[PDB]
Each structure stands twice: as structure tokens, then as C-alpha cells.
Amino acid sequence: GPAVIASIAYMDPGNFATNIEGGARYGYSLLWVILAANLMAMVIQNLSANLGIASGRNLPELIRERWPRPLVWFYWIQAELVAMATDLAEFLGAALAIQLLTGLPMFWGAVVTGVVTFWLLNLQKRGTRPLELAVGAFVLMIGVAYLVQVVLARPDLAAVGAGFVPRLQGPGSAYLAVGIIGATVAPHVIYLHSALTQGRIQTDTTEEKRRLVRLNRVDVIAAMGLAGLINMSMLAVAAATFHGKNVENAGDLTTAYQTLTPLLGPAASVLFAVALLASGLSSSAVGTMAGDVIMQGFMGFHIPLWLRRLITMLPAFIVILLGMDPSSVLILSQVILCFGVPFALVPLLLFTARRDVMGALVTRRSFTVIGWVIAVIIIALNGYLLWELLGG
Ligand SMILES: CCCCCCCC/C=C/CCCCCCCC(=O)OC[C@H](O)CO
Ligand SMILES: CCCCCCCC/C=C/CCCCCCCC(=O)OC[C@H](O)CO
Ligand SMILES: CCCCCCCC/C=C\CCCCCCCC(=O)OC[C@H](O)CO
Ligand SMILES: CCCCCCCC/C=C\CCCCCCCC(=O)OC[C@H](O)CO
Ligand SMILES: CCCCCCCC/C=C\CCCCCCCC(=O)OC[C@H](O)CO
Ligand SMILES: CCCCCCCC/C=C\CCCCCCCC(=O)OC[C@H](O)CO
Ligand SMILES: CCCCCCCC/C=C\CCCCCCCC(=O)OC[C@H](O)CO
Ligand SMILES: CCCCCCCC/C=C\CCCCCCCC(=O)OC[C@H](O)CO
Ligand SMILES: CCCCCCCC/C=C\CCCCCCCC(=O)OC[C@H](O)CO
Ligand SMILES: [Cl-]
Ligand SMILES: [Cl-]
Ligand SMILES: [Mn+2]
Ligand SMILES: [Mn+2]
């Protein structure tokens, strides 16, 4: 199912870190963030998909051919920082799941992750098909587990209802709300989702274009709606499990399995870690593939795929060697990703409103306004958080 495959692709280790920590530390009060970020991602990914259908090119390619060279260089560098921050959460989340399963130190967990990710890149498309379905089964069923657990946990519905009213409770809640937006509105997909759509036309004609826009819109919203229900459920179960109970290391990903213990029993620790590992390995390989496509779109050339894989591993090993907490840096990476969202939105909103780019598929003037409002909101939230990190 198209809703199933995309919800699994969007459930990266960054979502696990932000949902568990969000519910455990702030209860249900951040449910409106997940709902809002999911609705924003619906509009943004629809524009990114409609850009590839109408133009036949991805967003990095259109920037390379239309904007002045120094601006293309700056946009390539910031998209490369998005690449490292995206891979940092996924590569480390897999290494963390290795520790949750085997007990190896985080350094060796990254070594095992590095060997698997290096080997996973050499595989062809026909060899990874059973693996893409395998990782999907693990992540999907864990998502359904939280959907069932959010009912069985009997959440305080008075607190659940109030959590959908936007309330930012200081700087700490703004830090985690920004991380949830970055974990939902993935800037790496903003550049990439155009490349998945480019060429999806069977044969060039306006009729086929409006057909694929119709199909993509239904599939994206259905998947996002499912991913949003799972994310809200995982945060709500984390709130019912830890919030207010003063549990040692609550919100951390090493104790997140306790959210599914009343449903899974002794299997909650293995099933959660296996899902965290599968979510980390698949998203780290896809992101590495996407980063290479993004560089070719911006610069017309790329570095060897093994070299890109080696460079993205360096921040993960350094964080491990520094003794930093894995769950905390996963959240930090999503916060940095949220600062890359407005940079990706500006060319997206500008290109999807041009006839020489979209042809007959120019975005409705209303949705262009909504897209700019989303950009101003995320800029304000990123500015609101970055303000209190300097004092205010
Ligand atoms: C591929 C799927 C199967 C997974 C197998 C990975 C394949 C590559 C393993 C390389 C060595 C990593 C194995 C662990 C490192 C060996 C040394 C070790 O175990 O060290 C433990 C000690 O506690 C530390 O001080
Ligand atoms: C917090 C902010 C609230 C967010 C509000 C949520 C609105 C729900 C929108 C869902 C998908 C929107 C799809 C928009 C598709 C626009 C396509 C268009 O305008 O036509 C162009 C042509 O069809 C091809 O490019
Ligand atoms: C935090 C976001 C990412 C941080 C990014 C920081 C670096 C910005 C990139 C290049 C410097 C400005 C462009 C100059 C280098 C591009 C070479 C070029 O094509 O143009 C040269 C000159 O600027 C023609 O006027
Ligand atoms: C299109 C049909 C209407 C959409 C159906 C939902 C009804 C609420 C309206 C918009 C949702 C977003 C706004 C809801 C949040 C209240 C307004 C707000 O943002 O302020 C926050 C809070 O009230 C400060 O204390
Ligand atoms: C491509 C990005 C565009 C570049 C443009 C701006 C870049 C700034 C990025 C991140 C600043 C935020 C750093 C967050 C560091 C906060 C450390 C922390 O742990 O915060 C704790 C929180 O206050 C309670 O838990
Ligand atoms: C068909 C295959 C289906 C079965 C496959 C999954 C079954 C998992 C079985 C044993 C869990 C091994 C872990 C030992 C018990 C863990 C329960 C627990 O309390 O967790 C402690 C935690 O590891 C401390 O941090
Ligand atoms: C991160 C700072 C710079 C890191 C860079 C130094 C690390 C090199 C060490 C081991 C990798 C060696 C991999 C060898 C792969 C062989 C592929 C080859 O033949 O190289 C030609 C070209 O790279 C493609 O065709
Ligand atoms: C704190 C609140 C934010 C503070 C920071 C302010 C940033 C505001 C960003 C966008 C405003 C609306 C911009 C709408 C631009 C529309 C441009 C357009 O439609 O086409 C013109 C294009 O430049 C032809 O090449
Ligand atoms: C890198 C991606 C993000 C770019 C980062 C841009 C940072 C600065 C932009 C906007 C400032 C944020 C404005 C926050 C809104 C609060 C300011 C305000 O209006 O104060 C309220 C009232 O005036 C007092 O009583
Ligand atoms: Cl242009
Ligand atoms: Cl409460
Ligand atoms: Mn994500
Ligand atoms: Mn930890």
C-alpha cells in the first residue's frame, strides 16, 4: 500500500526520539505540534511532488539551471548540512538499537552499522526488495502497536484534548516542538521527493500530469494521516507511561520499550529495538542515496558513494567518543533540520508558482499563500527558539 510504504519511510529514528521525549517530559501538551507539522508536511510534499510532475526536474536541478552560481553553491552547502544532520540521527539510531539488542558499546554499534550500511549500498535494487518489505513489516506493526496501546493505556482525555490547543511552555518545549517539526517536515525529502516524481509520467501530456498529481495527493495525505496518528499515539503512550511518574531516564530511547510492555510483555524490548534498527538502517541508506542525488542536482557532479558514506559517519563516531547521550543528539539533529526547512521552501514556493516551470500545473494562488504562511510560521518558531537559546 502507498500509505503503508510512505509512513514507514517517514518513521525515522528522529521521530522515535522526539515522540518519546516529548510525551514523557511534556505530557500531551505537544500533540498540536505533531498535528500541525503533519498538515504542513502534506502541503509541502504535495508541492515538491507537483514540481517533479510538471517540470520533470528535481528542486536541486532547477536551482542549478536558473539561479546564479554563488547562490547555487550556498544552497548546495546547506543541503549538504541537511544531509549530515539527517544521517546523524539515522546512523546513530541504528547503532543505539544494536546496543539495545546485543549490548555492544556504542562505538562497536556504529562499526556494525557502518559495515551494514556500506554493504547495503553495493546491493542492487532487486536484492533490497525483500529487505524493503522486511523493514516495512517491523516498523508498520510497531506503529499499529502504539495505535492499539493508546486506546488500552486509558489516557486522560481531558489532558489529551487540551494538548491540541497550541501552548509553548517555555524554551524547553519550544526546543522539542522545533525538533518535532524537523522530524516530520524532512527537508531532505523536500529536495528528493521531486526526484521520485521526475519521470513518473508514462508519456508527456497535461492529462497524465493532472492524473499523477491526483494520485500523488491521495497517497501522500493517506500516508501522512497514518503517520500522524502513529506519531501522536507514540507521544501519547509515552505521556501515559512516564509523564508525572518521575521515572529514571524517562524519554530516553533505552527505556522507551516500557511504553509497549503492557501490550507486548517481555517482547517489548526486542520488538522496539528491532524496529529502531530497521528504521535506522533503511533511512540511513536512502538518505545517503538521496544526498548523492542532491549533489548531482546542484553541481552536476558527485563524489564517490563510498566517500560520502565515510564522511557522514564521522559526526556519529565523534559524538560516541565524546560520551554524548544518543537520544539527545537525535533530537538535536531534528532541530537543526528544522532550520533547513525555510531554505528549502523558498525555491519550492517560487518555482511552483511560475508558468515557465509548471506550465498548466501552476499551483493554486491560495495554496501558494498557505505555503508562505507555513514558511513564516517555521521561521518564527525557529527564531523564537533560537532567541531563548541566547536569553529572552
Ligand atoms: C552483517 C550482519 C551481521 C552482523 C555482523 C557484522 C559484520 C561485520 C562485523 C565486524 C566486526 C564487528 C563485530 C563486533 C566487534 C568485534 C569485537 C568485539 O566484539 O568487542 C567487544 C568488546 O566488548 C569491546 O571491548
Ligand atoms: C498549519 C497550516 C495548516 C495547513 C493546511 C492544510 C491544508 C490541507 C492540504 C493538503 C494537501 C494540499 C495539496 C495542495 C495541492 C496544490 C496543487 C495546486 O494548487 O494545483 C496545481 C496543479 O494541480 C499541480 O501542480
Ligand atoms: C548555514 C547555511 C550553510 C552555510 C553556507 C556558508 C557558505 C556559503 C556558500 C558559499 C559562500 C558564498 C558564495 C561564494 C562561493 C561560491 C562560488 C561562486 O560560484 O561565486 C563566487 C562569488 O561569490 C561570485 O560572486
Ligand atoms: C477550515 C475549518 C477550520 C479548521 C478546523 C479546526 C478549527 C480551528 C481552526 C483552525 C485550526 C488551527 C487553529 C486552532 C488553534 C486555535 C487558534 C490559535 O492558534 O491560538 C492558539 C491558542 O488559542 C492560544 O492560546
Ligand atoms: C541548515 C540550518 C540553517 C542554519 C541557520 C541556523 C542554524 C542554527 C541551527 C541550530 C541552532 C539550535 C541549536 C540547539 C542547541 C540547544 C542545545 C539543547 O540541548 O537545548 C536544550 C533545550 O533548551 C532544552 O532541552
Ligand atoms: C516467533 C518469534 C516471536 C518471539 C520474538 C520476540 C520474543 C522476545 C523474547 C524474549 C525477550 C528477551 C529479553 C529478556 C526479557 C526482556 C523483558 C524485560 O523486562 O526487559 C528488560 C530489559 O532488557 C532491561 O533493560
Ligand atoms: C573524511 C575525510 C576524507 C576521507 C577519505 C579518505 C578515507 C579513505 C580510506 C578508506 C576508504 C577507501 C575506499 C576505497 C574505495 C575504492 C574505490 C576506488 O577505486 O577509488 C576510485 C574512486 O574513489 C571511485 O571510483
Ligand atoms: C517572524 C516572522 C517572519 C520574519 C521574517 C520575515 C520573512 C517573511 C518571509 C516571507 C514573507 C512573504 C514573502 C512572499 C514573497 C512572494 C514573492 C513572489 O511571489 O514572487 C516574487 C519573486 O521574487 C519573483 O522572482
Ligand atoms: C534558519 C531558518 C530560520 C531562520 C531564523 C530567523 C530568526 C529571526 C527571524 C524571525 C524572528 C522570530 C520572531 C519571533 C516572534 C516573537 C517576536 C515578537 O513579535 O514579540 C512579540 C511581541 O511583540 C512582544 O510583546
Ligand atoms: Cl526563477
Ligand atoms: Cl496532565
Ligand atoms: Mn522523519
Ligand atoms: Mn540514551
What is the topological layout?
Elements (H helix, E strand, L loop, with lengths): L1 H9 L2 H14 L4 H25 L3 H8 L2 H34 L3 H17 L6 H24 L4 H6 L8 H14 L2 H11 L8 H37 L18 H4 L3 H32 L5 H18 L3 H14 L1 H11 L3 H4 L6 H24 L4
Helix pairs in contact: 1-7, 1-11, 2-9, 2-11, 2-15, 3-9, 3-10, 3-11, 3-16, 4-13, 5-6, 5-13, 5-14, 5-15, 6-13, 6-14, 7-11, 7-13, 9-15, 9-18, 10-13, 13-14, 16-18
The structure holds (2R)-2,3-dihydroxypropyl (9Z)-octadec-9-enoate (9 copies), chloride ion (2 copies) and manganese (II) ion (MN) (2 copies).
Radius of gyration, taken over Cα atoms and rounded to an integer in Å: 20 Å
Distance between the termini: 47 Å
- According to CATH, the homologous superfamily is Amino acid/polyamine transporter I
Which structural class do the helices and strands define?
mainly alpha
Bound molecules: (2R)-2,3-dihydroxypropyl (9Z)-octadec-9-enoate, chloride ion, manganese (II) ion
Number of domains: 1
Strand content is under 5%
- How is the biggest beta sheet arranged? none
Total beta strand runs: 0
Query: What top-tier CATH class fits best?
Result: Mainly Alpha
Oligomer: monomer
**Percent range of helical residues:** over 70%
Give the overall shape.
globular
PDB class: metal transport
Keywords: Membrane protein, divalent transition metal importer, LeuT fold, NRAMP family, metal transport
Assembly: monomeric
Entry title: X-ray structure of the Deinococcus radiodurans Nramp/MntH divalent transition metal transporter M230A mutant in an inward-open, manganese-bound state
